[PDB]
């Protein structure tokens, strides 16, 4: 089974995290995060 298979659309909480994000501490991704307009999810779901 692929990750996230079989999950119900109705409930749950999905989270996306980026490591080394804070700028106060030198973080590899401080720059890569500032570029983002948004995050985009491509959800392929099944109806039956």
């Amino acid at each position: 089974f692929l990750p996230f298979e079989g999950i119900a659309i109705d409930q749950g909480t999905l989270t996306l995290s980026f490591p080394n994000a804070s700028m106060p501490e030198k973080g590899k991704q401080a720059t890569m995060l500032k570029t983002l307009n948004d995050i985009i999810l491509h959800i392929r779901y099944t109806i039956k």
Binding site: I7, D10, T15, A30, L36, I47
Partner: protein
């Protein structure tokens, strides 16, 4: 195999393997034959219950979701709060279950995370039910602009 079946259909009350094929008295013979009967039953019920379902894709942008929260709850523009929260370790944004903040755990404190509830997406609104009574996510793939 029983579990993978109880997963492929949402039906979790499925009981296809009953104790016990093996017997203390007797060799425990016919245990194998008995099991393969139950497996044959599982496959039969499975084939009768299989459906070439409606396979559908829906695309969702987090920013749209964050901006779309009702007035009572706290909505935001994603780009801004990301930038703000990168600059100060302190930052946080959004109502519970649709929040954006830094990680709680000891390893993940420096990491920044976005959160969405599938509930708030209200994807059931895309198609009338009927047809769909059960909606299963086949695959998730992420695009980052």
């Amino acid at each position: 195999a029983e579990q993978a079946y109880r997963w492929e259909l949402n039906d979790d009350s499925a009981r296809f393997i009953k104790p016990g094929a093996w017997q203390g008295t007797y060799a425990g013979l016919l245990a194998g034959e008995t099991l393969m009967l139950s497996l044959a039953q599982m496959e039969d019920a499975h084939l009768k219950r299989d459906k070439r379902a409606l396979e559908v894709e829906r695309t969702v942008s987090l920013a749209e979701v964050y901006a779309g929260l009702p007035k009572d709850n706290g909505p935001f523009s994603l780009a801004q709060e990301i930038d703000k929260l990168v600059s100060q370790g302190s930052g946080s944004a959004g109502s519970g279950n649709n929040n954006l903040a830094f990680g709680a755990g000891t390893d993940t404190k420096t990491s920044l995370q976005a959160s969405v509830s599938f509930a708030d997406l209200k994807i059931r609104e895309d198609y009338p039910a009927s047809l769909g009574k059960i909606r299963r996510i086949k695959q998730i793939s992420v695009t980052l602009p």
